[PDB]
Amino acid sequence: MSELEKAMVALIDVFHQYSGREGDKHKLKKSELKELINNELSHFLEEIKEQEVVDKVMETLDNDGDGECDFQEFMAFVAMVTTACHEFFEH
Amino acid sequence: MSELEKAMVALIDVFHQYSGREGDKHKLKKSELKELINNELSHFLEEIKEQEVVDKVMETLDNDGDGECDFQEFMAFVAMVTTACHEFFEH
Ligand SMILES: [Ca+2]
Ligand SMILES: [Ca+2]
Ligand SMILES: [Ca+2]
Ligand SMILES: [Ca+2]
Ligand SMILES: [Ca+2]
Ligand SMILES: [Ca+2]
Ligand SMILES: [Zn+2]
Ligand SMILES: [Zn+2]
């Protein structure tokens, strides 16, 4: 696999790892999302230590209102954070 | 970096590699897009050997009509292919 291909597979993997912990195994509940951010985005996003932050993040990414992050919504979240990384550095 | 973080950086890298070849260094023209697909998505997408295919792919991903793929549009493309990978395997 190319680096791009590897990257795509890594997005699927991390989503499955976390989504599979509780409840619907193809969606991230707030707790799962919190830990994904805290463990796997520790360089790109401030650690979440407040309920109000978990709440706001989920509210922001949860486009279908079910209170969880599904795969499509996780893809959008990844794009948001990737874009923020891209922009953060002037080039 | 986590695997997720690495993946995000890899998306930015591959986009820059290809977008930087010609013209606007932050957009993929048809030729750049063709080679990105052919070289870096060789396991996930059929090799592009026809103009009509390059044309259709660009038309499909080009949401702002400028005839190129920008970073946002590339993110959407990556999500599309990642999703197709995810679904292709029943689990
Ligand atoms: Ca879950
Ligand atoms: Ca389990
Ligand atoms: Ca949702
Ligand atoms: Ca270009
Ligand atoms: Ca050059
Ligand atoms: Ca465009
Ligand atoms: Zn850039
Ligand atoms: Zn799955």
Curated annotation (Swiss-Prot), chains A, B:
This is Protein S100-B. GO terms for molecular function: calcium ion binding; calcium-dependent protein binding; identical protein binding; protein homodimerization activity; RAGE receptor binding; S100 protein binding; tau protein binding; zinc ion binding. The modification N-acetylserine is found at S2. Gene3D superfamilies: EF-hand (1.10.238.10). The modification Blocked amino end (Ser) is found at S2. Ca(2+) 2 binds at D62, D64, D66, E68, E73. Dimer of either two alpha chains, or two beta chains, or one alpha and one beta chain. The S100B dimer binds two molecules of STK38. Interacts with CACYBP in a calcium-dependent manner. Interacts with ATAD3A; this interaction probably occurs in the cytosol prior to ATAD3A mitochondrial targeting. Interacts with S100A6. The S100B dimer interacts with two molecules of CAPZA1. Interacts with AGER. Interacts with PPP5C (via TPR repeats); the interaction is calcium-dependent and modulates PPP5C activity. Interacts with TPPP; this interaction inhibits TPPP dimerization. Zn(2+) binds at H16, H26, H86, H91.
